[PDB]
């Protein structure tokens, strides 16, 4: 529903297109139910406006040879106003056009080859009947008389659209022939199809920028105020400038790009003139978008800036934003990788109220980025882009572009024996065979250093219930506590009881506390933010009191979310618990945590889960009803659940049929899930060593597990068993004394 | 009494108005007891000056068809100088007016439709008898001869008020016809009726700005000094600029708006000239208001500023404020969202002595904001604005405007199938059916991120005595301790004993310490500030020694107030109590608390309540007679009070008649109120799960409570019972050793 602006299904005005049995660009295919169903008379030349402000023209009425009804062109339009199937192109006539001047010869490379003579009677004499060359700026067509392999481009025209040429016109002979790079920048221009992994953010940008500008009457009639300040933020390299470049040519509004450093590079006084002229030029054209890339470069915080020119620039920008009234229809867009460094006076109502978060893409998002970036390369048949997307975790769009570049370079290194640096040229038999293979991508992955490794990942974890053995009661309770209020809120307000927002996991280590938190988020298809104990202790010593703010509201914007606080014992160990260092477990950090969970409304879908291995040193303040009142105990797996844990851990391992998992389950009494995983890993290491030794078979046999069972260490002692058991019944007693 | 300037009841010069049986704008209704009761002779044309500096004119003496005595017009004046019923419009004649020039034709859209010819004999020939078109700048009237559906506006006039036109006048033909947006900004101009939730602050602003300016003689005769500096402060987006815009057109004084960033955006030297010219222009006109929006932008603290131009600006502003003597009648108003960032030299006597606090509106306040903002939209019939106001808690006026915008956008997204982006227009059958429904508002509420969530809410809590089970003795004591000195202060000075200002709540956790503090504030209709333990520990580590100042005086200005200090054990746990970390519970923070409660006068209505679950680790210094000498013990609920607690918790739940609450009360011996609430919540979860399972009935039955009673955990142990009991008698012994 939120991305409804990007949906094109169930449209009766669209159809599928197939291959063409003919190979002639001069012909077009028509249909009776697409031409005789309206009032389009038999015109001479009609325009065909597709996407990216590009149109095309050909000879109409060139059909009644192939099938009717459905429409189908050749494959030459694969690079002309088309990138994929399923596009609706609005066809509309344009009669009563004016008459323009003529255009002289504009050769490219047709003089140093063959004979030329005059080069005038090969494109104007044979094509003058009912066709006066409806040329336009951006039209590419093939016309000649010697080999039919050269194109021609026009730059001389009085109006913007096409026109009918007329003879007997004087042309000033000062036209310089163009090079190749001037037109090669145009076809590969950035569009909406070059953005990968930002489907959700693109819908928001379209509905708050393009919609208020193309249809201001819709927003005016409904009595609403269209937002005039949009701030794109995210980690560096996520594609903020790419969206700017995409909307700079995919929108029918006057675009004005303002670079951050470019403004700040000017002298004192000359920079404010640039901002004033930019806003004045935008105000002149009613459809207008202003993009201020690198907003943090020109608008830092006025309480920690140094120079006076920066403060004057910030005040000038604030005045310019406030001075835009309603009738101008000017939308100011900005992009920064440091949204917290923006002056707070700018992220206020009426200036930059709207904020779009371009976060790190997930595996599905980055697969699309890889496909977009490799769409112009030549891959082999063994490349698996899904595998590359899965392996990359902290990678952003820039990181994926760098990875593709490194993979391409690795392919070049492999063919250095054939290429000669001292040679004037290199054979074409090795261009066409130069393909990037999967081993090239693996090598690039081996030393790709991602730039978003430290960033908190907000995604849906891949850990399902299948990865967790046993613990059915905990699964049912977690479902009834998280999945229930998010799918059936009507059952909760009827009974008048607010859902409990908060669960604490406690028990012996290595029992599935992290797996349960990830699985409950995976089943509900909700976001999951995992913040560990030591991560909070490191993140605060830099005297940053607001470092829990951007992680608590990060969950809030990603609703529904599961905010997991793993390894709380590490935090609690920093103060000793009851007496410790004099102060309780309520040290500098968790007090912020309690303040933040107290401030979150109960109607929100953000769920908070905490896990600890040391329930004796958690402060009682976190158990208060309203924060983490739900105390779910995670016991050691028993006879029945150990078989399930082993089966879950051995799902990806070729275990032979003779392995009796029940016997190993019954032999290990006080073994946690981590101990069983360690047993399986030791068995696999034994199998790997056996295979390597026997190389100078690829199945885990009974003896492999028998040998690994000998060294199996128990992680939880008998005394810890009784302590955890007596603590599973008296944890809520911690509040009071 | 404080808002007496906004009261209009018991006025004999007012009456109610009903609908009109006639539909003719050219007629007006008169009455004998409203026309023959004064000395108004039978004039030709009389003005009718309403509100917002707007007046209207029509043909007088057009009655004696409908009923007399009472007055009633048509519904066409619903947008002309009227927004609601109950308005008194001062009627006064204006004879001996001068004669002005003429006005040429000012067409709008009457040339591209129909026939025009001359367009002169359709508004001047048929209307010249005893009516010379008393036109004025801002008059809208309907006059034509073809369809009577076009209006006309004048801009050409020599004087300000209306005049009698005279023929044979030469007009310079240079008048450019006006567009639509130039007049569309005027009717929707901000007025006093566009302010929601600031009824109290508007009365203060009117009585310290409009009153001293409209009637300086009243202030001079009484021998008082009218304040000449008003500072509006509050959280961002609360409506400070909106009040500026409202007083800019609702007051009969020369308004001069000074923007903060607009001054600071000028060059060195040019900014001071702007301030000097602004003050000079204000001094020229005796009724004058100067508004300095974003005062913190131009007047930061001189001890932590960086540039010299800022210091020069601050000194110039100080000199300009001090240079205003008494006879100028110039009132300087300022608005900032950071009142603590203002230079302290400016918030002194004679400069900005008066301060008006525009805080976050309550539910009633924000309901009015929602009504004001949706007054121009088209809602459905299922929308409940009271529900939206109740659900929004940390929302301010800007947040509510954004929520309304998001709700309107959600409505547009639902109708994307009918609207066509490629179409040149869209059908009018979907404008009129485009209504925002309640589910649209629910979706907008699901991800509205309020900007005032961290702000300390100062409101009257909704927790009444009905929400608290039992504890009648504590209720009576709290009444006799808080409600008594605030309603009957005469009974206290007679006996000569000062009321005890301070109560400490101690006892086992989950017994109603927070509920009692909220209920005692709700019954007395007093404000309530809840500051928790961890909130104080987080709020101080940023090395902010003045962070308890703005919360203690916040209670002082909101008198009567109940300053609640909940979860004091979390504060006391930060030092260990008796020995702990060597220091006692008197750490960095509570020493400020004791200093602040020592400084508050006993005649104030601010009441301080503290609550703790660990009375063994509170320092004795807080129990000193004069701070929290009243030690109210909150015991565990007994047989009799548990039934009341269950009834209070089950007031909003459909419990069946077969549930015997006395039996569950007698079965749970050492159960706190939180334990009973948890039992009820578990029973409701069981009922919800049963209903969901049976879906593939909506009443809590006996078995639901029987099952939930099995897992009911006791929160307070037997040892804690005896410790709390022995501590309930010897808490005052803590002072001394
Ligand atoms: N979603 C994406 N889809 C496709 N290509 C992408 C995407 N994100 C990034 N890229 C590529 O990576 C490059 C990184 O540039 P940008 O991310 O646009 O720069 P930026 O977003 O302004 O971040 P900075 O420069 O560090 S502040 C882009 O120019 C693209 O080539
Ligand atoms: N119930 C289980 N089913 C399957 N594997 C499990 C289970 N419990 C633990 N494991 C294994 O043990 C690893 C650690 O799981 P965690 O959820 O992190 O345990 P924990 O209770 O959080 O304690 P630690 O301190 O994190 S080891 C998992 O990655 C699994 O390999
Ligand atoms: N009480 C209110 N009644 C009606 N509309 C309101 C109210 N408060 C805010 N608004 C709306 O929300 C917008 C917020 O703008 P303002 O609050 O006036 O700006 P501000 O008060 O100067 O706060 P800043 O700009 O963050 S310092 C207003 O323009 C109104 O549209
Ligand atoms: N007397 C009571 N009547 C009804 N509900 C109660 C009562 N006492 C406690 N509760 C419930 O328990 C919850 C907690 O109430 P509080 O006043 O916060 O208890 P407390 O004494 O302050 O101890 P904590 O640490 O806050 S749980 C309330 O929201 C109610 O749901
Ligand atoms: Mg950029
Ligand atoms: Mg873990
Ligand atoms: Mg303002
Ligand atoms: Mg409490």
Numbering used by the authors:
A (entry chain A), B (entry chain B): 12 to 707, 728 to 768
What's in the article?
Critical functions for p97 include the translocation and restructuring of proteins from large cellular structures such as organelle membranes and extraction of ubiquitinated client proteins to facilitate their degradation through the ubiquitin-proteasome system. Here, we present cryo-EM structural analyses of four disease mutants p97R155H, p97R191Q, p97A232E, p97D592N, as well as p97E470D, implicated in resistance to the drug CB-5083, a potent p97 inhibitor.
Despite varying degrees of differences in the ADP-bound state as compared with p97WT, all three mutants display essentially similar structures when the D1 and D2 domains are bound to ATPγS and in the state corresponding to conformation III of p97WT. The effect of the ATPγS-driven conformational change is especially noteworthy in the case of the p97R155H mutant because the upward movement of the N-domain results in the displacement of R155 by ∼25 Å to a solvent exposed face of the protein, away from the N-D1 interface. Indeed, the p97R155H mutant has been found to have altered responses relative to p97WT when bound to either p47 or p37 cofactors.
